[PDB]
């Protein structure tokens, strides 16, 4: 993990079986979303089959991104590399847990709460956006499901963010309902969380994309 040899982005790479499960879950919470009462009475905030609507699936594996590189030209690729753990933790099997599925107009995913361990993946430079504050490192962490038409992943940070700043200051509001494995809260402008009863448990492999 010189430099030279740096990838695209570390992160964690679901296993197929892993992958296909939380791939699985989520077109089912968009299928019952989009099918549920409070949803429907909400559409005018979100614009329909929320399957298709976040039909932008980046080919391969689902997964977890910690730091960006660039192949090593982004700001500070090569210190995140240079770390003992980096370098210890690649190919090395992991367990993230998923505590929610949320939805918004650009993005649909999986909130990541990564353990102790894993956190000492998490990159400790990113950029500290007002939506971050408050919020402890690693709070962004979460799975892409879909996106929108002309949606950019890395939107899918600050959407997450946003929705965890609305619950941090007491504005996540009442349950309007239940789903398969949670409960449903709207949080308006579009944007609705599935709380899991149970944390969905995914494993995966720390590596490089290279792609
Ligand atoms: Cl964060």
């Known amino acids: 993990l010189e430099k030279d040899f740096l990838p695209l982005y570390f992160g964690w790479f679901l296993t197929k079986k892993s992958s296909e499960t939380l791939r699985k879950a989520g077109q089912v919470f968009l299928e019952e979303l989009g099918n549920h009462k409070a949803f429907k009475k909400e559409l005018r905030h979100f614009i329909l089959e929320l399957v298709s609507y976040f039909g932008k699936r980046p080919p391969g594996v689902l997964h977890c991104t910690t730091k960006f590189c660039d192949y090593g030209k982004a700001a500070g690729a090569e210190e995140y590399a240079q770390q003992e753990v980096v370098k210890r933790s690649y190919g090395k099997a992991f367990k993230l847990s998923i505590s929610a599925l949320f939805v918004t107009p650009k993005t649909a995913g999986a909130q990541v709460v ?13 950029d500290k956006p007002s939506a971050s504050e408050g919020l402890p490192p690693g709070s962004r962490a979460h799975v892409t499901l879909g996106c929108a038409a002309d949606v950019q992943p890395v939107q899918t940070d600050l959407d997450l963010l946003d ?26 402008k579009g944007r609705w969380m599935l709380s899991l009863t149970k944390k969905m448990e995914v494993k995966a492999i720390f590596t490089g994309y290279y792609g």
């Open 114 to 126: 990564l353990t102790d361990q894993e956190l000492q993946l998490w990159p400790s430079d990113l």
């Open 163 to 188: 929705i965890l700043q609305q619950v941090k200051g007491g504005s996540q509001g009442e349950a309007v309902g239940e789903l398969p494995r949670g409960k449903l809260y709207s949080l308006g």
